[PDB]
Amino acid sequence: SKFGAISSVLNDIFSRLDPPEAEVQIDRLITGRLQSLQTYVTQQLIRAA
Amino acid sequence: LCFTNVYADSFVIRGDEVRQIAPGQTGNIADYNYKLPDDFTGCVIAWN
């Protein structure tokens, strides 16, 4: 999932973009994936209960 | 603000070459004369 960024591949962000906003794109992707993993863990906790 | 120590770098370049002085920006001056690190904090001054 692109999560609002321009690419779903980190190396694409590296090559096709210069660092200063490549950092912004990486931050967006990282926070999106962290949210996904948080959601998975929360649902696992409820199901475990 | 109050800084620890300030380093001033002075030189002269061409008119269109001014864009090359930037973090993560490549070019003849950048690759062979003067390259700014990406984690660069500071001002750059250019006047004709």
The coordinates were experimentally obtained by cryo-EM
Entry resolution in angstroms?
A: 3.0
For residue A19, give how far its alpha carbon lies from the nearest alpha carbon of chain B (Å). Answer: 6
Residue that the structure tokens 């190396």 belong to: A11
Q: Which residue, among B38, B39, B40, B41, would best test binding to A if mutated, counting the most A CBs under 10 Å from its CB? A: B38
Residue B40 to residue A1: CA distance in whole angstroms: 32
For residue A3, give how far its alpha carbon lies from the nearest alpha carbon of chain B (Å). Answer: 25
The angle formed by the CA atoms of residues B1, B2 and B6, to the nearest 5 degrees, is 110
Answer for the pair B17, B27: CB distance below 8 angstroms, yes or no: yes
Q: Which residue, among A13, A18, A21, would best test binding to B if mutated, counting the most B CBs under 10 Å from its CB? A: A18
Residue A32 to residue A2: CA distance in whole angstroms: 9
Within chain B, strands assigned E span none
Task: Give the dihedral sign, CA B41/A4/A26/B38.
Answer: negative
Within B4-46, strands assigned E span none
